[PDB]
Swiss-Prot record, chain E:
Additional notes on this entry: The capsids of autonomous parvoviruses expose a proportion of VP2 N-terminus and part of that sequence can be cleaved of to form VP3.
Protein name stated in the entry: Capsid protein VP1
UniProt remark on domains: The N-terminus of VP1 is sequestered within the mature capsid. It contains a phospholipase A2-like region and putative nuclear localization signals.
Location(s) in or outside the cell: Virion; Host nucleus
Organism listed in the record: Murine minute virus (strain MVMi)
Homology family: Belongs to the parvoviridae capsid protein family.
Full-protein interval shown: 535 to 632 of 729
Task performed by this protein: Capsid protein self-assembles to form an icosahedral capsid with a T=1 symmetry, about 22 nm in diameter, and consisting of 60 copies of two size variants of the capsid proteins, VP1 and VP2, which differ by the presence of an N-terminal extension in the minor protein VP1. The capsid encapsulates the genomic ssDNA. Capsid proteins are responsible for the attachment to host cell receptors. This attachment induces virion internalization predominantly through clathrin-dependent endocytosis.
Amino acid sequence: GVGVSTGSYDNQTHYRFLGDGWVEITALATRLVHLNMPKSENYCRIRVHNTTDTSVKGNMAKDDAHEQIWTPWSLVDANAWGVWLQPSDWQYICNTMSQLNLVSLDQEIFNVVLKTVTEQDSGGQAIKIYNNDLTACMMVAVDSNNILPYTPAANSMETLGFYPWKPTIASPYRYYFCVDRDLSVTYENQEGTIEHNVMGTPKGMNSQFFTIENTQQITLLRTGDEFATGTYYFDTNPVKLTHTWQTNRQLGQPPLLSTFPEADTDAGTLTAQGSRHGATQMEVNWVSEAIRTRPAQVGFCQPHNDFEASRAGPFAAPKVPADVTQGMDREANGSVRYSYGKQHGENWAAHGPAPERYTWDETNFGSGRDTRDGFIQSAPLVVPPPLNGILTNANPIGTKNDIHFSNVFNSYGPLTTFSHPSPVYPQGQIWDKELDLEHKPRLHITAPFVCKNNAPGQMLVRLGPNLTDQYDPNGATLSRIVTYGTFFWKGKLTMRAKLRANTTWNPVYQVSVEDNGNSYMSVTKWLPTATGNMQSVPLITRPVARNTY
Amino acid sequence: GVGVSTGSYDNQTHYRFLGDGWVEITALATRLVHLNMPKSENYCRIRVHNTTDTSVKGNMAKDDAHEQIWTPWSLVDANAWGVWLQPSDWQYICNTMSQLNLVSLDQEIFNVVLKTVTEQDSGGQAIKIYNNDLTACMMVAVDSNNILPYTPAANSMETLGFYPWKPTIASPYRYYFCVDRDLSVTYENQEGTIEHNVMGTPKGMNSQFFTIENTQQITLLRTGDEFATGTYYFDTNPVKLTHTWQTNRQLGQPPLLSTFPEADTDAGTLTAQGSRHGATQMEVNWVSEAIRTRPAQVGFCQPHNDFEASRAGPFAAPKVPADVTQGMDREANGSVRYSYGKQHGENWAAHGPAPERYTWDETNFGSGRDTRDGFIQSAPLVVPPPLNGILTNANPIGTKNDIHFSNVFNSYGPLTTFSHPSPVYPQGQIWDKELDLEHKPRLHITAPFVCKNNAPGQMLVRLGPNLTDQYDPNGATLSRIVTYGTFFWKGKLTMRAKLRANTTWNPVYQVSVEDNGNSYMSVTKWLPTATGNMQSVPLITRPVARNTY
Amino acid sequence: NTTWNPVYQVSVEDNGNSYMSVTKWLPTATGNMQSVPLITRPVARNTY
Amino acid sequence: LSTFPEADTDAGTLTAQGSRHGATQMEVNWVSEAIRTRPAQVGFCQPHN
Amino acid sequence: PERYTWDETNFGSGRDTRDGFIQSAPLVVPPPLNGILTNANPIGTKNDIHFSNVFNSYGPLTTFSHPSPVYPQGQIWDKELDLEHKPRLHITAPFVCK
Amino acid sequence: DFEASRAGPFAAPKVPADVTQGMDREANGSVRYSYGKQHGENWAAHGPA
Amino acid sequence: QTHYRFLGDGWVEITALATRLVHLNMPKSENYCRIRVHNTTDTSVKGNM
DNA sequence: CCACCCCAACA
DNA sequence: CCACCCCAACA
DNA sequence: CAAA
DNA sequence: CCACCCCAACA
DNA sequence: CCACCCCAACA
DNA sequence: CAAA
DNA sequence: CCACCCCAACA
DNA sequence: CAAA
């Protein structure tokens, strides 16, 4: 029974240089995991209604009231980048390869360890002895039939360790349940009251209570037991490791230069606007670099800081990423935002239960939109636009001062384009199911790859209940022995990508590691410390042009 | 699972007498090893800067400031002689065989034991109970891809026991990391200050941080698990178990004797120097035994006690071994020097944390160079050399008294030869990689054999982390159970050598063991004691001529 | 890619004054052109 | 390393030089990081100018 | 004209001439003065003329990297001196037809 | 030169090389021979020279 | 042009080309000359070696 | 899976 | 079941 | 040993 | 031994 | 009837 | 050239 | 003798 | 259209 192992340990990254710059990247990782005993061996329908940030008047974007359901089952997510790659690899990848895809994924578990603890030592100070239970279990449920919801733990930064030589932990599986809410708007102090702040009883219509021990099979794993899945093949679209910058003013034949400089420090000049040949969609007589007809609408003006509503009511409305103009609208061009803990970054030697993030500002420049240059004219596009014939960024709307029109605008015409949300080395996600909606989003912001068909089945792990001498279920609270366990986990993630060309003349930007300054990109940041702490800093993947038009 | 063994125990030395004095020596050894729990399960980049031997003025040859990196991984080295042979064997070998080589090497591990200790006994005096954990691991990583550095533990006298019936220990793996230094010279008291004694921040250029749990595979060994490597074939040059003595004055046709003695006590005499037939490379008219043109330059005059510099700055500059003339320049003819502890010699019954060595003085006589007879003449090689026409060993240089010219000299002309650094029974090394430099040393001083191609892969061993009931990695310090283990280790080392001839008339020197005196070579030195202690004394291997020219 | 730590490379920075800054390469109003000798070997090799 | 730092800003320390195990090509009794026997001679000192 | 002084990368190889250093017989660490020869110790009776200017440590225990290419300018290939014996390398070019 | 060892001295050879317009004849280690009749000499000379 | 080929086993093949247009004038002399240079203006100094 | 102080009563 | 800092001395 |  | 909320990407 | 300090560059 |  | 920023819509 |  007990004695021999069940698995190996591969946290290697294998490269294969095929024919025609068709590389095959096979990443592995064997993380050792610790899983304790669920507090409850029940299913609970728990609700949260923070009436301490909900009973204010301005605190709307602070609504955290949701009706959740807890499962004694502990999940296992590895849908992250940091778990599959190293700082180097990525560098070699993003820095060399053009595009990239996602192939297979083969998860495996082995060398299961199960131990018990007996709080002893009353005839002294206090000591907890640890011994094994070579008869114990560890229910493993792999829900591929994707019957249950899809909870990408990477969501709430609840994944698997990034440091392959550091024991990590799982994420207790919990899923959403139908309730119903109604919350009204209100500013700072406003007068009167809010009126109603109601939850929602069972909507015996949208109710959807599941049970792992009902829908998915369980493979009671002991000690000498090995659980392993099959090779899940992916059917997703590639991802381009290249960034653009071709705006609308940088697409087509530049104006004809009738005059050229005569020596550095003397630019050229075009010819009489209203005498210049070309087309335009404006009824004036003079083509400009702004008027002139182009192929499409680079990037679109999305209302920033919306805030929509429904049955759980609020909720900010995302953005599809886009640079943060020379004005750093950073909140419009919906640049994101992350907050991770040690087990996913942080100065692995910091203090204060204070998270840490790194606002991601896309590269897909020439795409972004500056909100500090809005601008809209009227009928006869009179250039020297009067005032009553324009609407700038300062012109109030709704009678609210700091409330502009760019906050409502929405320019998503059948003449719109834009780049896909690029990956994010550490933290960042990988793949993500797809909303089972008749019609669907062009993309998900939450991940560069979206399986087109079913998706990987989630892998749920639980300790098996270890009982004592007593147990009459007609017992309010039942006694169980303190049982916990180790198992290793290994992962196969396969990708296949192409090798970039070199079409320019000018070198191009890359990722490097500088001396040790203070610059974001400086070793020390990565290599350990006297003791042995370790950071991971999200890096750029896409450093390199792509001549859009 | 548990019950049956996994390996044997062979610390035998097998001989095979092939056809044509082609012997095959297959040495084995099964050392039992003890490996404790790493203090840290982290990777640390530790530095040392002894500013207590560095802030002096003369103490330069005491700089011990290096930026090291510690690995939770414990290494296993057997690249020694003492581990592969006995006092007898060697005697039989070095004493009989002419030359010798190095063939295969097959390492193996088995009968893995893993136990836990529970400090108990507060209801008394204090007792630590020991029990087993038949579910525990012991990560074994064999880095052959020689990706990581090459740390011949035999370097810092950190190898495997020599006494096959005495449990030994491994060596925690640590490797060098790029820093940068600058230290200035200074004598005894000198005036002023040193100026700067600086370390070196990350040279985000020479940085090279590795991770075993990233580059090399790990074979999670349990109790009933056996890990074994393949037979590594060697591609190195043979080694001659013969010593020379043919100087430059002992290569060619001796002068013609025109007069012979008439009875013991009356030597012969040659004929008028400046009337003697022969050649010379000196413009004089009289051939001497010193002037006369020979085939080459036996041995070369290397600057002794150099002391060069660079980025970690100092460092003595080696020497290729050469006798220690009748003047025992012992420091020039770079005779070495060892310092070992019990587990590699020492009066296995001594006291005081005081090491012990044995200055090795090569045999490759007629090669060495005496620094007490230097000598250099001028243009018209006037024999009765005036003073202002010579430069002896007493003639100052640089304005420093005890600072001579022999300290700078360097006679390594395309007419130089010399013997390879001979082995050193106990202690001494065996094989050693090779500097991946476009151009390479003719030899390594540090070992008689240097694999011409890749080299054996190092074998790294670690305990697997045994966890407790608690573990939130967002935990400053994590709790782990005191876990340690035994495993045996066995070794196959194969060599093939030739049987010496007997071309002289006069017997020749050998290795023997005298009665019990006080002489270096006297039994008692080897055989145990009342109790049972044991020495190993490095012996001579090469006792026997070889007519060089 | 055997290490863990990224490693140095050659890149082209914004336009400063640093040796490695575009403008240095791309032509000029007129059309002149420099060539600046660059580094080839940016990357370790664990000697021993 | 017989002594390890306890937190960034406190390097480790080796053990008594003339008590340290290892080899050397110098006739003294205390191995250093400069004395200690290595494989070869990295780079060479050429007469400049 | 215009140039660019090439400073190899083959670090850990280079040698600092501002830390020379040579001791005598019994390698007494606290080296007296008359028992050393530093970078400031004259030679030939010339002040700014040191011993590092004459030194030559090219023992059968020497290694070093090949002169690396030099993108622009720099050479490519170069014949080989028809000498019975030949240089280990040419500084003037990374590749030397054999 | 003049080096030493166990039979002690001995000049240290030279690999041949011209004798510059200054005829260093002893540096550029030009050699040197001395033969008798049965290998040259004015097969009709005198003096054991 | 500069053509790249990604073979099997990271064995790339780089084929570089270049077609430079060249201008070549008429040699001043259609003779062979043995010319010498002896700068006795940097040679007749004392330090200028 | 014990043969004449090793491999090897060899296979 | 150790080959030249990866897959892979590949099969 | 970088090709084969 | 993971395919589109079951058996069952069935065999 | 000369091969790498023996038989023996074996046959 | 020590294996083959 | 034009195919998806190279060789090469390869042959 | 990135595989096939």
